[PDB]
Amino acid sequence: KVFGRCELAAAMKRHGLDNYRGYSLGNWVCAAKFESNFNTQATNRNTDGSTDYGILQINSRWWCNDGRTPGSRNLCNIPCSALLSSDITASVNCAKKIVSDGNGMNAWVAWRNRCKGTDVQAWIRGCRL
């Protein structure tokens, strides 16, 4: 599913991401924009052989099981395919784990490089949430 900006913001807020671990909703929407372009089906292989999955590009190196990431963990205790669903619940639940791990949203390199420090409120501007 390719979400619209305001549709995703509304879904993220419903699922409890707004100000989760202090990160305003626009941070989450910005991250998803640059990680996946709001496409729940996005997948991208990493150099180390892991893969990133879904709207928030969660990595098989640590967080989910895809059966082809040697030596990896599955800390969210899910199959990586679950992160590609049209319903964002599994991705949100896992993202809450990740953001709580110690480095906040710096876990998402696109967030640090493209969202951090910017006017992230723009991402939810005009939205009926």
Ligand code: VO4
């Ligand atoms: O395509 V991945 O480098 O962890 O974002």
Ligand code: VO4
């Ligand atoms: O021993 V278990 O971490 O799923 O509770």
Ligand code: VO4
């Ligand atoms: O309630 V679903 O979020 O699992 O629409």
Ligand SMILES: [Cl-]
């Ligand atoms: Cl957009």
Ligand SMILES: [Cl-]
């Ligand atoms: Cl694996």
Ligand SMILES: [Cl-]
């Ligand atoms: Cl933080």
Ligand code: NA
């Ligand atoms: Na894994």
